[PDB]
RNA sequence: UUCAUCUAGACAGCCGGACGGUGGCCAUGGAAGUCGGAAUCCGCUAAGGAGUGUGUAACAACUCACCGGCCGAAUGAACUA
């Protein structure tokens, strides 16, 4: 469910209990990267990977806390990979 | 010079055909909460809170395609701001004045006008009830709720927001430091 | 500080260094250096008239603060929450005629501000206590427990033990010689000469009368610095357990299961605390007035001599000591003139004469 | 003397802001920039650092470095005798 401390979009008012995620930084990695993402990273560190394993990531900006409405997915694609130390995911800039 | 010439290019392109002309003064601002109004207004009116070029904001119009450009040349003052759109401007001022989101003063900055504090219920557990000695306001706790006994003056005209007696005015939820976007002049073409 | 990173540079490689004969000499070489490092951390006897001092150690928690507020009987705010604070002191309880002064010791659990000016202060004051309460949550006690004991052993505190019966006397010729009483199941002569090497001990004889470990031997060479003194493990938030294994928790030595919120076993905790503090009470008496019985002076079991009592009153008193009159079981027919070397006992009445 | 900055408004000084992606990847009791460890790109803008610092057990709470408004004319560094 996430190794980094996952923030939630959760308010507690009179029986409101639902584990919902605001699509933070470290959970789109949990989805896009392989299921060995919440597991097999206790002592390992994996700074490897450059496969273009997806190209339709623009299906996430609607719940990715809209910031760049006039750009489709350049924020999602060309910014991640550098700070996202797991892989690169893009042979455009690295 | 060369590094700043793009600001001339960016104003020149905008000053070719776009029919609306509108200036606004933005001296006090909360930029963060005033750039979600820059994101709700995507592509409608590109904002321009420019630099001291007020002198050749009108001089550089030597092309004189719209020779009224010599319109704010005797107005080299203030924080003039340029917005423009191809729609009737009478609807934008509805949305750009409602955003009067406010914050406390700079720990004691100016006070907009004299503020009177009544006895209005808030609904919180006893917190700073043991910290009402700087101003000396009588406060009683009932059923676990803070209630003001007597209405005591806080601020005055002539004197400004304090730091010991005024740290709780936004616990009373007033808007002393807002200075929302203000129209200064409108002219089309 | 480079000293702390050196210590870490030792610990990490020792941990990744597995245990066998080939690494035996290197690890023997390296524990002694680690000791040399920690002593200068410890670099900075007790005649505190006072009453007594007992320390509370444990990670910050609601139950722990409830417990200390209960025991001290006083409440207020904001001071029990700062973790930068070295130690806190307001709170003295009178118990069976003797006061006890308690401490909170958050500074012991550190590592970000450990090498600072007040770190030595908090360590030193923590090291002069009569006992420590090691507070745990019974549901997650382990991870805290190893860290706490690790830090105490790092700072020279020995818990629930006694000084090892190991004798070392220096010679000039013949090098290092060993006497053995019980067979050694852990210490090889390679380790013996290893640890002897760093301390520049060219020649001496070492006598073993118990199965000492490497740490025991190091403590023996560090006898003047280390302190052996009791500690009690306190287990709070026991409300979620059950009685059948609560009795099994009673099979752990020095373990006192309590629940601070509803105040279970506070009596047993107090009784055990006094039992292991082993504090003797002495009532002073002048010529005219009868003893007060209100403010007895308190000593330890191993320091209850007349000379100790006189020093406890004042340093100059021992020099001005004429003789002593004693009411109690310490003497045959009370009262009887006694000297400084005479050992006192609990609840006695003592009168000193000026010379 | 040689470099530079400056009416396309410098140096100061005041006053205003100082944003998102994203708590960037590990260390985990914890790092949103700030006990530490390898990293260092982008969008609104004229401008906001995967960060200067005060500081939280962590967050916020303050500051700068960046630009803007006033002021309206010179200023900054190195060197020579």
The per-residue DSSP string of chain A comes to --SS--------SSS---------HHHHHHHHS-STTTSS-SS-----------S-GGGSTTTS----SSSSSHHHHHTTTTS-TT----SS--
Method: cryo-EM
- Tell me the C-alpha distance between B111 and C126, whole Å: 52
A65–chain B nearest CA distance, Å: 12
Pick from A66, A67, A70: CB nearest B43:
A70
Length of chain B (residues): 189
Q: Which chains touch C (3 or more CB pairs under 8 A)?
A: none
List the one residue out of C205, C206, C217, C212 whose CA is nearest residue C182. C212
Go through C334-350 and write b for each residue having 16 or more CB atoms within 10 A of its CB, e for each that does not: eeeebeeebebebbbbb
Structure tokens that stand for C338 in this block: 């006694």
List the one residue out of A75, A74, A77, A73 whose CA is nearest residue A89. A77
Cα dihedral: C81, C82, C83, C89 (round 10): -80
Reported as half-sphere exposure (CB side, CA atoms, 13 A), residue A88 has a value of: 10
Q: Are C175 and C203 within 8 A, CB to CB?
A: yes
**Residue C222 DSSP label:** T
Q: From residue C303, give the alpha-carbon distance in Å to each of C212, C229, C345.
A: 27, 14, 10
Q: Which chains touch B (3 or more CB pairs under 8 A)?
A: A
Chain A interface includes B123 (CB < 8 A): no
Structure tokens that stand for C348 in this block: 């006695």
- Tell me the C-alpha distance between B131 and B135, whole Å: 9
For B57, the 3-state DSSP assignment is helix
DSSP β-bridge partners for residue C166: C208
Sign, CA dihedral C14-C20-C22-C26, equals: positive
B79 in contact with nucleic chain D (CB within 7 A): yes
Q: From residue C208, give the alpha-carbon distance in Å to each of C164, C179, C189, C190, C350.
A: 9, 6, 13, 16, 42
A62–chain B nearest CA distance, Å: 15
Structure tokens that stand for C76 in this block: 């207020």
**Residue B103 DSSP label:** B
- Tell me the C-alpha distance between B41 and B47, whole Å: 10
Query: How does DSSP assign B108-154, residue by residue?
Result: S---SS------------SSGGG---SS---EEEETTEEEESS----
Helical pair C21-42 and C117-126, crossing angle rounded to 10 deg: 100
Chain centroid, CA C341 distance in Å: 26
**Residue B34 DSSP label:** T
List the one residue out of C12, C8, C6, C11 whose CA is nearest residue C31. C11
Q: Are C98 and C50 within 8 A, CB to CB?
A: no
Cis peptide before C335 (omega within 30 of 0): yes
Chain A interface includes B32 (CB < 8 A): no
List the one residue out of C194, C188, C223, C190 whose CA is nearest residue C208. C188
Sign, CA dihedral B10-B13-B15-B17, equals: negative
Which residues, 6+ apart, have CB-to-CB distance to C256 below 8 Å? Answer: C232, C233, C234, C235, C265, C268, C269, C272
Q: Are C230 and C276 within 8 A, CB to CB?
A: yes
List the one residue out of C279, C325, C268 whose CA is nearest residue C302. C279
Q: Are C128 and C55 within 8 A, CB to CB?
A: no
Q: Are C93 and C73 within 8 A, CB to CB?
A: yes
Structure tokens that stand for C100 in this block: 């006890």
- Tell me the C-alpha distance between A65 and A25, whole Å: 11
B40–chain A nearest CA distance, Å: 10
List the one residue out of C104, C92, C27, C47 whose CA is nearest residue C309. C47
Length of chain C (residues): 355
- Tell me which residues of chain B, numbers 40 to 79, contact chain A at a CB-CB cutoff of 8 Å: 42-43
- Tell me the C-alpha distance between A65 and A58, whole Å: 13
Q: Are C214 and C28 within 8 A, CB to CB?
A: yes
**Residue C325 DSSP label:** E
Which chain B residue lies closest to A67 (C-alpha atoms)? B39
* Spatial distance from the CA of A54 to the C1' of D38 (Å): 27
Which residues, 6+ apart, have CB-to-CB distance to B79 below 8 Å? Answer: B25, B26, B27, B49
Q: From residue C15, give the alpha-carbon distance in Å to each of C8, C18, C190, C326.
A: 10, 7, 20, 58
Which chain B residue lies closest to A68 (C-alpha atoms)? B39
Find which nucleotide's C1' atom is closest to B52's CA.
D9
Instruction: Give B39's contacts in chain A (Cβ within 8 Å).
Output: 66-67, 69
Residue B3, number of CB atoms within 10 A of its CB: 6
Length of chain A (residues): 94
A65 in contact with nucleic chain D (CB within 7 A): yes
Q: From residue A51, give the alpha-carbon distance in Å to each of A32, A47, A78.
A: 12, 13, 14
Instruction: Give B43's contacts in chain A (Cβ within 8 Å).
Output: 70
Using alpha carbons only, give the angle C4, C7, C8 rounded to the nearest 5 degrees.
90
DSSP β-bridge partners for residue C234: C135, C256
Q: From residue B167, give the alpha-carbon distance in Å to each of A7, B49, B163, C102.
A: 31, 32, 6, 38
Structure tokens that stand for A53 in this block: 């394993």
Chain centroid, CA C187 distance in Å: 27
Sign, CA dihedral A93-B3-B7-B10, equals: negative
- Tell me the C-alpha distance between B180 and B30, whole Å: 9
Instruction: Give A66's contacts in chain B (Cβ within 8 Å).
Output: 39
Q: Are C39 and C225 within 8 A, CB to CB?
A: yes
Q: What pairing do the DSSP bridges indicate for beta strands B139-142 and C227-229?
A: unpaired
A41 in contact with nucleic chain D (CB within 7 A): yes
DSSP β-bridge partners for residue C133: C56, C232
- Tell me the C-alpha distance between C224 and C299, whole Å: 22
Q: Are C310 and C340 within 8 A, CB to CB?
A: yes
- Tell me the C-alpha distance between C106 and C82, whole Å: 9
Which window residues (44-63, chain A) lie with Cβ within 7 Å of strand D? 45
- Tell me the C-alpha distance between C151 and C217, whole Å: 19
Instruction: Give A75's contacts in chain B (Cβ within 8 Å).
Output: none
Which window residues (92-111, chain B) lie with Cβ within 7 Å of strand D? 106-107, 109
Chain A residues within 8 A (CB-CB) of chain B? Answer: 66-67, 69-70
Go through C297-317 and write b for each residue having 16 or more CB atoms within 10 A of its CB, e for each that does not: bbbeeeebbbbbbbbbbeeee
For B182, the 3-state DSSP assignment is strand
Identify the residue whose Cα has the smallest distance to the C1' of D57. C83
Q: What pairing do the DSSP bridges indicate for beta strands C157-159 and C227-229?
A: parallel
List the one residue out of C175, C179, C177, C170 whose CA is nearest residue C208. C179
* Spatial distance from the CA of C152 to the C1' of D57 (Å): 21
Q: From residue B82, give the alpha-carbon distance in Å to each of B4, B49, B52, B75, C24.
A: 18, 7, 13, 14, 78
């Amino acid at each position: 469910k996430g190794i980094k401390v996952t923030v939630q979009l959760k308010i507690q008012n009179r029986q409101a209990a639902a584990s919902v995620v605001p699509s933070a930084s470290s959970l789109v990695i949990t989805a896009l990267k392989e299921p060995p993402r919440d597991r097999k990273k206790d002592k390992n560190v994996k700074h490897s990977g450059n496969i273009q394993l997806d190209e339709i990531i623009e299906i996430a900006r609607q719940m990715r806390d809209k910031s760049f409405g006039r750009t489709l997915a350049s924020v999602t694609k060309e910014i991640l990979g550098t700070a996202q130390s797991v892989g690169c995911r893009v042979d455009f800039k690295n | 010079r060369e590094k700043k010439a793009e600001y001339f290019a960016k104003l020149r392109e905008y000053l070719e055909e776009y029919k609306s002309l509108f200036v606004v003064g933005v001296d006090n601002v909360s930029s963060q909460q005033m750039h979600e109004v820059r994101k709700e207004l995507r592509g409608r009116a590109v904002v321009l809170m420019g630099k001291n070029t007020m002198v050749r904001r009108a001089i550089r119009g030597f092309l004189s395609d719209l020779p009224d450009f010599e319109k704010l040349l005797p107005f080299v003052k203030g924080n003039v701001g340029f917005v423009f759109t191809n729609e009737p401007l009478t609807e934008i001022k509805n949305v750009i004045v409602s955003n009067r989101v406010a914050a406390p003063a700079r720990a004691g900055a100016v006070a907009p006008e004299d503020i009177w504090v009544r006895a209005v219920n808030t609904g919180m557990e006893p917190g700073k009830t043991s910290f009402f000695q700087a101003l000396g306001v009588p406060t009683k706790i009932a059923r676990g709720t803070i209630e003001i006994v007597s209405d005591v003056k806080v601020v005055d005209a002539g004197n400004k927001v304090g730091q010991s007696e005024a740290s709780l005015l936004n616990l009373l939820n007033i808007s002393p430091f807002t200075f929302g976007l203000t129209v200064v002049q409108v002219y089309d073409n | 500080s480079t000293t702390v990173e050196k210590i870490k540079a030792i610990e990490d490689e020792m941990a990744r260094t597995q245990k066998n004969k080939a690494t035996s000499f290197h690890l023997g070489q390296l524990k002694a250096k680690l000791a040399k490092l920690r002593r200068e951390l410890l670099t900075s006897d007790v005649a505190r008239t006072g009453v007594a001092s007992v320390g509370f150690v444990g990670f910050p928690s609601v139950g722990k603060s409830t417990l200390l507020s209960k025991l001290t009987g006083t409440e207020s705010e904001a001071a029990e929450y700062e973790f930068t604070t070295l130690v806190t002191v307001p709170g003295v309880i009178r118990y069976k005629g003797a006061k006890i002064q308690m401490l909170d010791l958050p500074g012991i659990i550190d590592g970000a501000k450990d090498g600072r000016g007040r770190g030595k202060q908090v360590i030193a004051v923590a090291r002069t206590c009569n006992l420590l309460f090691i507070i745990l949550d019974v549901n997650k006690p382990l991870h805290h427990k190893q860290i706490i004991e690790k830090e105490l052993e790092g700072v020279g505190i020995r818990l629930n033990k006694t000084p090892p019966d190991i004798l070392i006397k220096k010679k000039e010729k013949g090098g290092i010689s060993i006497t053995n009483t019980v067979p050694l199941t852990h210490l090889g002569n390679d380790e013996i000469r290893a640890v002897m090497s760093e301390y520049r001990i060219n020649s001496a004889e070492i006598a073993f009368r118990c199965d000492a470990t490497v740490d025991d031997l190091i403590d023996v060479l560090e006898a003047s610095s280390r302190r052996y003194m009791p500690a009690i493990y306190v287990l709070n938030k026991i409300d979620s357990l059950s009685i059948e294994e609560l009795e099994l928790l009673y099979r752990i030595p020095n373990a006192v299961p309590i629940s601070s919120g509803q105040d279970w076993n506070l009596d047993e905790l107090l009784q055990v605390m006094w039992d292991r503090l082993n504090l003797v009470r002495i009532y002073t008496k002048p010529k005219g007035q009868i003893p007060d019985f209100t403010d007895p002076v308190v000593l330890r079991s191993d320091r209850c001599s007349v000379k100790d009592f006189c020093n406890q009153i004042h340093k100059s008193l021992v020099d001005d000591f004429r003789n002593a009159l004693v009411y109690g079981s310490s003497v045959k027919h009370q009262p009887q003139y006694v000297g400084l070397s005479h050992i006192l006992e609990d609840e006695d009445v003592v009168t000193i004469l000026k010379k």
